[PDB]
Every structure is written in C-alpha cells, then in structure tokens.
Design a protein around this nucleic acid. Structure first.
Ligand SMILES: N=C(N)CCCCNCCCNC(=O)CNC(=O)C[C@@H](O)[C@@H](N)CCC[C@@H](NC(=O)[C@H](CN)NC(=O)[C@@H](O)CNC(=O)C[C@H](N)c1ccc(O)cc1)C(=O)O
Ligand SMILES: [K+]
Ligand SMILES: [K+]
Ligand SMILES: [K+]
Ligand SMILES: [K+]
Ligand SMILES: [K+]
Ligand SMILES: [K+]
Ligand SMILES: [Mg+2]
Ligand SMILES: [Mg+2]
Ligand SMILES: [Mg+2]
Ligand SMILES: [Mg+2]
Ligand SMILES: [Mg+2]
Ligand SMILES: [Mg+2]
Ligand SMILES: [Mg+2]
Ligand SMILES: [Mg+2]
Ligand SMILES: [Mg+2]
Ligand SMILES: [Mg+2]
Ligand SMILES: [Mg+2]
Ligand SMILES: [Mg+2]
Ligand SMILES: [Mg+2]
Ligand SMILES: [Mg+2]
Lengths: 101, 116, 64, 102, 88, 65
RNA sequence: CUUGAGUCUCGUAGAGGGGGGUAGAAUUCCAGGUGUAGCGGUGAAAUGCGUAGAGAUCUGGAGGAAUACCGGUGGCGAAGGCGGCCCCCUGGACGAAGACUGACGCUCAGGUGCGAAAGCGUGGGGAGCAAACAGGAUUAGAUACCCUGGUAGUCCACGCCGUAAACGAUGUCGACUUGGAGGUUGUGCCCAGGCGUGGCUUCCGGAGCUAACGCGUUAAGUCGACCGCCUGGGGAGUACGGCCGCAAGGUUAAAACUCAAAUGAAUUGACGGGGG
C-alpha cells in the first residue's frame, strides 16, 4: 500500500530528527518497504499556535509498506512526546517527484 | 502610571452596550455601560446611548494618559459604529479596528424561536 | 476553470501558493460560483484546504 | 450601596390585585362551577374579586334572576371571603359585587 | 471484494479452461468464497445492515444458480456441492 | 475582519473599510441566523424556496426575449 | 440458440454502511490577574444575577455535544436516511472493449428482514437545548402565547417498540411513441475548442390522456405480466375475538343506528389583523 506520512516535531528537539528519520526508514525497509520519497523542509512558522508553540520541524515521507508496519509507526508517533502532530494518508500510486516544500 | 497605548473592547449586544478600556495585556483600567449612563429599558439599546457610554469611558481613563487605541468590537448591536466615532472625538488615535464576534463552526443548539 | 485548463489530476494539500487563491482574507473557502472552478475540482480543492488546516499550513480563522 | 437587597426583603410581603370574574343571568351549573374555582383560587392567594353580572336587551326586565346569582356566589364564598360592595341597582346594564379575603 | 488473484485461482479450479468465467460451477464457487470471507466481517460488525443486504443477495443468487444446475445436470450438481462443502 | 489604519488616512475612510470588510465576511448575517434553532425540515424548505426563485428569475429574464 | 439474466478483465465518481483515532471554533463550568457598579430581560415590566465583587477583559484548566465556510432543484442509498479530517473492515452503481454461461427470467398471498421522531427496560454520560414543573407577566379569565429558571429526554452500549403528511399523497418489471433549455458523472474521435456516445438528474412543452387542475420518453400517453387496495357520509380504523408487545400500544377488523347528502376541481362575487 502506497502511504504518505507527514509529522511535525517540537522545535527544541529539532536535532532528534535525523535520528528519527533513520529509526523509521529502518522499520519500513526492514519489512520489504520502499522509500519513494523523503524530504525535510525543516523549521517553519505555524499558521496557528499548537500547544503554545509557534514553529515546528516538518518531515515528508512517501512510502510503500505492508499494512501492519504503518500501524506500528503510528503507535510510535503517539508515545513519542516530541512529535506534536502526524498525518498518515493513503495514495494510489507511488510519488517520487519533489514537493514544493 | 501612564500607558499611552491600550485596547478598547466594545460589547455591542441587542439590549445594551459595554465599553472597557484595557492595557496591552488585557488588564482593565475603567469601564462604562449604556445602562449606567442614565438611559433605561429599551432606551439603552440605541446608537446614541452607546455614544454617551463611550464618552463616559474616555473620561475614566484620563488619569492613565492614553493616546493610541485598538478597537475590539464584539456583537450585532446598534452601538457598533457610533461607539468608535465617539472614541475618535475624545481624542484617542485609533490604530486598528478588529471584529471579534464569536461564530461556532457547526456547536451548541440555540434556544427555540419566539412565537409572537 | 484553471484546473481543467492546466490538466490537474489531483490538487495537493502542500501547494499552499495555489490554495491561497481559493481562501478569503478571513480564511474561508471561496464558492465555485465566484472562482469558476469545475465541481469535481471544487470538491478536491475543499479536501486539500481542510488537510492543510490540520497541518497548520493554512489558518482556520484570521483571528487565531 | 445596594439596599436594593433590603427592598427585596420588604417586597416578599404582598401586593393585592383585583381579579374580575363576569357572570350572566342564565349561566349553567358546569360553567358556574368553573368560574367558582377561579374565585376560590384568587381569594386563597389573597386577591380581591370584582364579580360582575351583565344584562342584555330584555334580561333587564327580570332583574331578580340576576340578583340570585350574586347571592349564590356570596353564600358559596361566605367562609372564604367578606362582602365589600353588594349592589343595589343596575348601573348601566351591569351589577358589580366586590369580595375580599377572609 | 475478492482479489484479482483469488478470483483467477477459482476460475482455474472449477472452469473448463481459464477463459471459462461464465459456467455455473465457477459462478457458484466465486460466490461461496466471498460468502465465507464475509462471515468474519459480520461477526465483528453486527450492525452493518447496509452491507448485510449485499451478502443476502449473494446467498440468493447462489441458491438460484444451484437450482438451475440440479435440473440441468444432477451429476455436475452433486460434485459441486461436495467440493464446496454445501449441505443442499 | 482586521483593518489596520493606514498612514495619513482619515478615520472615516478606515471606518468605511471596516464595514465593507465585515459585510464581505458576513459576520452579522451569521449571528442573526444562529439566534434561534431552525429544525432541519425548515432549513430544507427555505433552501428549496430560494432555488425556485433563482430559477424563476432566470426564466422570466430570458422569456422576456 | 444468444438477443433477456448472469460471471470475468481495466477504470471512474460518491455525506452508502460498520469500527477506531484526531482537529479547530463555540457555549457552560472551575481557578487565578486587572477592574467596579451594574448586568440580564421585554411591547412595557418583573422574577433572576451582583459589593461573600457580578457583567466586561486576560491567562490557565475541565467536560459534553455538534461540525461554519466548501454547499449546489449537487451527490450516495431499497426505503428510513447519510455532511470536519485520517486509517481499518465492507455493500451497491456506472463506462470502455472483449471473453465466458446458455432462459439460469419477471412478479409475489403467507413468511423473513430493514424501518424517522417520540416512548420503554438495564447500565453509563450530561455542555447546550427542553415536555413536566416552579416563579414573573399579559388578560374579562390565560391551566397558553412572552420572560427567568428547570427534570425526564435529547448523547453512548445492549435489548424492545414497528409507527409518521414513512409523500412523487403516483406498486414492481419490460416494450414502444414528436421536441427545447440546463445540471452532474463516464467515454470515443478530431484539433484547449469542435464533433459523437452512455448513466443519473432539474425545468418547460407537442400529440395523447384527464372532471378539471394538470401529466407529458423519469407519463397521469400506447401496451403486456404479477401483486396490493376501493365500493355514500358519519358511527370507526372504533367494538368483540385472534396474533404481537414489559408497557405505551400495534396489527387484523365488524354491526346496530342515523343522514340525504358527504366529496373533488374550477367559476363569479364578497371578505382577509395578505401584497402592490
Ligand atoms: N383588541 C384588543 N382587545 C387588544 C389587542 C391586542 C393587544 N394589543 C397590544 C398590547 C401591547 N402588546 C402586548 O401586550 C404584547 N402582546 C401580549 O402580550 C398579548 C398576547 O397575550 C396576545 N395573545 C393577546 C391576544 C391578541 C388577540 N387575540 C386573539 O386573536 C385570540 C385568538 N387568536 N383571542 C381572541 O381573539 C378572543 O378569543 C379573546 N380576545 C379578547 O378578549 C381580548 C383580550 N382579553 C386582550 C388581550 C390583550 C390586551 O392587551 C387586551 C385584551 C386580540 O385581538 O386581542
Ligand atoms: K503527541
Ligand atoms: K440538567
Ligand atoms: K378550462
Ligand atoms: K384487539
Ligand atoms: K349507512
Ligand atoms: K382583495
Ligand atoms: Mg437513489
Ligand atoms: Mg467500497
Ligand atoms: Mg429516539
Ligand atoms: Mg433510555
Ligand atoms: Mg431554557
Ligand atoms: Mg421557556
Ligand atoms: Mg399508516
Ligand atoms: Mg421523509
Ligand atoms: Mg417529500
Ligand atoms: Mg400512502
Ligand atoms: Mg420484489
Ligand atoms: Mg410539462
Ligand atoms: Mg387519472
Ligand atoms: Mg384499534
């Protein structure tokens, strides 16, 4: 299934991001999962205050992965209290071409 | 202590008008209603009764020495435009006028329609 | 309609420049009567804006 | 300051109001009994009752018929009320009795 | 619905050819698969009345096809009901 | 609606700008319609009424050659 | 046997259904800061709230319910109905080209299921709203309409109930019979534009039909198959009996008696606290 994950990180813990990117991409590729795109737009200004913050660290990942690993990736995002917000969508095809960030 | 820059909150209901002047942080200085300014009953819900309440509020904040104001109007009532014009005449420079009327995006069920 | 002319297959929640042409100053979705958007694309455009608002890429209201 | 408070404590006494009931010379038993229950209620709440009786056309010829209604009402509310202005003549095309509590 | 692969299997197992999608045995087989699959769905989701209506038309279409086969050729009928494990 | 007063602009023009901005947003029309509860059958009836009008105008316009 | 009915392949649109998560806005409440005499309500008032500091304004928290804008005689569903966003499970429809089965069909008394809101049972929950109820008014009276409050209920789980102007007041399936203007969703061809071809849907109108009003290829027209139902008004969808339900009640369903009408559409007046 072609998914598409976005997640935002607390701007203080902006240096845990390359670690987290590795930890997650590992679990995808460690169950016959591709990574058709990964981007890191970095810190940008929030359009409204999320729990008192005014900025956060954005990470896009397009993926092709088996059902259950995406469920496990969601349980991670929950309990990791550095992740302020996340969004797992489905897609029809794989997306490789670059976003406008 | 002198302030110079504050905020003018206008609560313009159908039945009354309240006008509070606050600082930058929303700490109050002095207030004036259109019910406390003589007018009673349905007299207090006129455009004129609001003008008076604005003018009476201007003179409660003489001792704080305010020059600049921002105007936070809230409601559908008659004393919307006239309250602002009154604060202009009282000598305050008006930096910014903002509507802050609450709308629920749905929310709670309102009361039944009046059969009259 | 733009999206017919350009041959857009899906409108993106990340193309914030394009989405900003279809919200108000207050930050409400503009009707298709006004813009001239075809009805299929109005439905996509609306989904996109609501996804953008969740990720705080667009505002819900102008008075946040 | 306030004293409004004290006014509210003074207000929880009473104000007497006058409740008007209107009979006619020919008024049937059931409809009489309804109007009596109105009067009982008013008097037990401590209010005055202006019982009227009207005449039309040639009902004025038989004034005695109307008088007995007012007498019947009076005797039914004897224990509850006192009479204050039992009528003498037809003033206009009306007679007016006024009762009062206890 | 049944997958493209799961379909293609049953067309081979029951068909007389693998273009033979039409035959009564294939049709009955395809329906039996999806009926059995949905027994799991309605175990959890007991108040999905709208989907259950789709199920009951599968059951109805199968019963009709079987009754056609019983009178067209009783030999092929008795084979099919044992393979698929149908009582009647 | 947020209207910053611009440099060397008089109060009257800024007050007019505030009105149009509120008109465009439709702030008061929202407050009016949310004052009392309108049950769904009523809202559907009103929707159908204005639809017939909108159509009837377009006809009578074009039906007048 | 392949033309009705099905199956397969590729795609398309959708508030179709079930489960779980989550977002922003708002109302109320709680706890603080600033501030001080009013607030609230009406046709007019009063009840109510506030110096034990309200209302207003600011910050932080708590909880429940519903998803502004998009939004549309737009869409989906057998009907009832279905509207934030995301995932999981799942039903139907439609189009293009073929391939396959070979009348496998249509309708349905009994039967079985689904079925708005209120209501019932057992547990939860409870912001807002609100039958009953309490107080304030209005009035000849006012067991109302208006005002301040307010319990069941409205929400959730599981079970029951089986009714609505549950309406298009129009049963299901199939064939045939001039046109015009739109919406929505596929698709072919030529060169965005042009020229075709399907599905669904809104408005006008021809023949014909109709008591008239109107209906008019989505028929109330022309025909064929099967089912349901009607036989003057009241008495009465009531009584009795049966079945069903915890109950409320539902369902099936008469007769005596009484009247010469009751009724539908349209016409001319008059009238309206309807409009110009
Ligand atoms: N012409 C009139 N007398 C008065 C005209 C109305 C009053 N004028 C406005 C006064 C100021 N405004 C208000 O006060 C706000 N309104 C209220 O609060 C009153 C309401 O309560 C309202 N419902 C009163 C009845 C109106 C109307 N009545 C009817 O239409 C109904 C039937 N629909 N009843 C009848 O017609 C008769 O059966 C009995 N009429 C009667 O005996 C009359 C009754 N006793 C009465 C009511 C109010 C009043 O001030 C004086 C007398 C009416 O014409 O009176
Ligand atoms: K989190
Ligand atoms: K309560
Ligand atoms: K005629
Ligand atoms: K019975
Ligand atoms: K008879
Ligand atoms: K007239
Ligand atoms: Mg449909
Ligand atoms: Mg599906
Ligand atoms: Mg209910
Ligand atoms: Mg209950
Ligand atoms: Mg209430
Ligand atoms: Mg009430
Ligand atoms: Mg019925
Ligand atoms: Mg309905
Ligand atoms: Mg209807
Ligand atoms: Mg009917
Ligand atoms: Mg049928
Ligand atoms: Mg027509
Ligand atoms: Mg007919
Ligand atoms: Mg009965």
């Amino acid at each position: 299934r072609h998914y598409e994950i976005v997640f935002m990180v607390h701007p203080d813990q902006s240096e845990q991001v390359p670690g987290m990117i590795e930890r997650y991409t590992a679990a995808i590729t460690g169950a016959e999962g591709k990574i058709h795109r990964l981007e890191d737009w970095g810190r940008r200004q929030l359009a409204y205050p999320i729990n008192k913050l005014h900025k956060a660290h954005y990470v896009l990942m397009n993926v092709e992965a088996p059902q259950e690993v995406i469920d496990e990736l969601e349980t991670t995002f929950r309990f990791n209290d550095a992740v302020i917000r996340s969004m797992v969508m489905r897609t029809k095809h794989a997306v490789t071409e670059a976003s406008p960030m | 202590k002198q302030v110079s820059d504050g905020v003018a909150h206008i609560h313009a209901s159908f039945n009354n008008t309240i006008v509070t002047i606050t600082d930058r942080q929303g700490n109050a200085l002095g207030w004036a209603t259109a019910g406390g300014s003589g007018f009673r009953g349905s007299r207090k819900s006129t455009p004129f009764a609001a003008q008076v309440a604005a003018e009476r509020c201007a003179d409660a904040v003489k001792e704080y020495g305010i020059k600049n104001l921002e105007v936070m109007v809230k409601g559908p009532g008659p004393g919307r435009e006239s309250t602002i014009r009154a604060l202009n005449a009282a000598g305050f420079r008006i930096t910014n006028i903002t509507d802050v009327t609450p709308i629920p995006h749905x929310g709670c069920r309102p009361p039944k329609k009046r059969r009259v | 309609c733009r999206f017919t002319a350009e041959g857009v297959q899906e409108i993106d929640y990340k193309d914030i420049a394009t989405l900003k042409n279809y919200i108000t100053e207050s930050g409400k979705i503009v009707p298709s009567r006004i813009t001239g958007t075809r009805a299929k694309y109005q439905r996509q455009l609306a989904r996109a804006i609501k996804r953008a608002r969740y990720l705080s890429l667009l505002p819900y209201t102008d008075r946040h | 300051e306030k004293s409004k408070s004290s006014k509210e404590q003074k207000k929880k006494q009473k104000v007497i109001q006058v409740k008007e009931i209107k009979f006619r010379p020919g008024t049937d038993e059931g409809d009489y009994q309804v109007k009596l229950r109105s009067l009982i209620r008013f008097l037990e709440e401590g209010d005055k009752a202006k019982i009227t009786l009207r005449f039309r056309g040639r009902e004025m010829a038989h004034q005695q018929i109307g008088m007995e209604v007012l007498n019947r009402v009076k005797d039914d509310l004897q224990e509850l009320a006192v009479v204050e202005s039992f009528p003498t003549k037809i003033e206009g095309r009306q007679m007016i009795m006024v009762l009062a509590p206890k | 619905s049944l997958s493209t692969e799961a379909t293609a299997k049953i067309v081979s197992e029951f068909g007389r050819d693998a273009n033979d999608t039409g035959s009564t045995e294939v049709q009955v087989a395809l329906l039996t698969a999806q009926i059995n699959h949905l027994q799991g769905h309605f175990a959890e989701h007991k108040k999905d009345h709208h989907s259950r209506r789709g199920l009951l038309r599968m059951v109805s279409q199968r019963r009709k096809l079987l009754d056609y086969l019983k009178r067209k050729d009783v030999a092929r009928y008795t084979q099919l009901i044992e393979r698929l494990g149908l009582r009647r | 609606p947020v209207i910053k007063v611009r440099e060397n602009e008089p109060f009257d023009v800024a007050l007019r700008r505030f009105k149009r901005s509120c008109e465009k947003a439709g702030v008061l029309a929202e407050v009016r319609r949310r004052e009392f509860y309108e049950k769904p059958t009523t809202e559907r009836k009103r929707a159908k009424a204005s639809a017939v009008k909108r159509h009837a105008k377009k006809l009578a316009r074009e039906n007048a050659r």
